[PDB]
Subunit: 386 residues, 2 copies
Amino acid sequence: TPTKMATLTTKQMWQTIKDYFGDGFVTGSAPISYNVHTCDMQLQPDSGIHAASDGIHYGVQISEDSMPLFSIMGDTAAPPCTCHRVDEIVKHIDEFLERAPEALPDDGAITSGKPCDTNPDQVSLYAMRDSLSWWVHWGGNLRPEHYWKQIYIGFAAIPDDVQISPREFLDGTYRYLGHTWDDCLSGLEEEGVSPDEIEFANMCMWRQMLTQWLEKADPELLPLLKGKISLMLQYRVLTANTLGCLALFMNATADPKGPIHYADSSYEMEIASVAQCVTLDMAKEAMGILQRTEVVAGDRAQRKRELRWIYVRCMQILESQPHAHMLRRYGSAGLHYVPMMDRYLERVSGHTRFPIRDGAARILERFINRAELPKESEDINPNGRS
Amino acid sequence: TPTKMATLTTKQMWQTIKDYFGDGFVTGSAPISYNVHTCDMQLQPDSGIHAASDGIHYGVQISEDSMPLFSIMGDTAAPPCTCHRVDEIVKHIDEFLERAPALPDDGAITSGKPCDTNPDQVSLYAMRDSLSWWVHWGGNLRPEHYWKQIYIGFAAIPDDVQISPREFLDGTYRYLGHTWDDCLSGLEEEGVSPDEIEFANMCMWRQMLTQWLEKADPELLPLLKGKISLMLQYRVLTANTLGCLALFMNATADPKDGPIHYADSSYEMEIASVAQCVTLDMAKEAMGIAGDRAQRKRELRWIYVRCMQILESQPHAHMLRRYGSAGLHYVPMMDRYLERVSGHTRFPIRDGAARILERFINRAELPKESEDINPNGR
Ligand SMILES: [Mg+2]
Ligand SMILES: [Zn+2]
Ligand SMILES: [Zn+2]
């Protein structure tokens, strides 16, 4: 076997995740399609009669018919289905990756939109704060046995704020708070995550890094998805990687009496990952007010009715799924983590950064591999090693 | 029976609830009757071992150690205990009622939103809030719980409209056209057992009395201000989270548990009613609306995590965990609180919400100036 070790091109990485995920419910949709078609979800009437063990008792339960009571909400309406056009998106990405150079001038730049972000390791530190905050609102704790699962969350958070070349992520050039990606994979192995589960979360991260980079590097991609709400939602869940994060969270939280097999649990996991992404839009509306009142109508209002339509049906499906005791809370967690997390309060307060207070810095310290930090980042989290 | 005790004074109302509730964990404390004592609670380390049926999976779970991650939160601190002198609070109120008067500001609106001029319009916003709370607790809008939701409205309105206890009991005060007796009769028709109804009724009596005493007796609040742990107990009674909880559990429980009896479940119910009050204050201060505000915030988080941990192992955790922590998601979503931060105004009631609220109005018993409230709900 001639040892060939040239770093995969972005096109070859795209092809790798195609071969792994395969098509979703539309042919030619690999790798950017889920197996579940949310446009086909139905809402069952609630008889109000529930056993003590019913899944409706988990998470946050907001009936569809009650949503007009809340001014930031309203009623629901079925979205139009543009999902069959996903093959045209994949074809376009195939074209773009054939000609794309192996590196870009803007690779590694800050894209958080906040003018005070100038050091990528500082941005990574704020992402670790955010990552642990999500973990806790999902239901997890800060016990040390889940260290590398929480590092994974940080890897999932940072490509939103930093343009990360998928090749530098792959080959070890990019480091999150001093950790290479392979350091994270090796850590998950140490934490006992099964090889099959690691590869699933690994491929989900490959797909996130690729789709995050594509929307920054290919100016045509987002305008292609815009307005096609069913396709845009699918793409947003991929760039958020709520599915990969969920896989490792279930591993950390599961009753010790088996492994998380996508084959068996793909449906509940995809449904729960879609629900949490929709809660972001539902909850962000209150933020500006919590600091800005406006009448929203027309197509803007229609998009919100469609997102609420998807959310309530996702949540009802989770009631009867085997892991409702974990997934209902994951699905609705944004209804309480958005109003509490610095990440979102910072945006409303003039796009500044909240200082990392002493208590938070001490929590974050152990997630930093200082030995592998650049010289210019030697001084990050100064109040943390106290 | 000869019709005796046809009318009740405010003093006899106090004696009635005193005889009904009995003492709490201190002698002579009736009707301040909670047996749970927040000051003595202990937080246990999380083992991390939780079965799928574990109660930690219900509600919102925010570990104490994680709270410094959120700038609007922080660390915790134990509160000082003054609870063992609730008996002197009761003796103080007994003394006041020997000479209690009718207040001059009866009927006035106290909503904090200057645009409120019609008490029945204020009641309609309170009904909006009441269904919003009910939904975030986990409830639905099915018609068989109508009068339980009216009960929530009665519990919400005395903060926004000054209501005398006597006018409340004799039907002079009407909530959206309903007398209090209408609600009691309605709960009977809904199948709530007579013992459950009387419990909810006595909790409402206690709420109306405790909230009235705060305004009528100028010495009561200064007396409580120096006794924070007792002021918390008192605020829980003026919020009537326990009476609302009893009726919510009745609507939400599996019909294989029989009636939800407070004699049976008083411990978990008291814990949950305290959790909800603490969460509400903890969330209102944090997200933007007490000798040391900063210190009290640390004590509220201290109480919150200990109450929630106790709820993990309670028989009705599948209802009470969410009840205890619901404020973490209803405070940022409900018009009631968004209206306050947004210049203390009122958000219009859109046609969709008006149609929900329409059936809750007894239009036949409204005054003339209020005949046409909720116009877009028909
Ligand atoms: Mg750019
Ligand atoms: Zn579709
Ligand atoms: Zn005490």
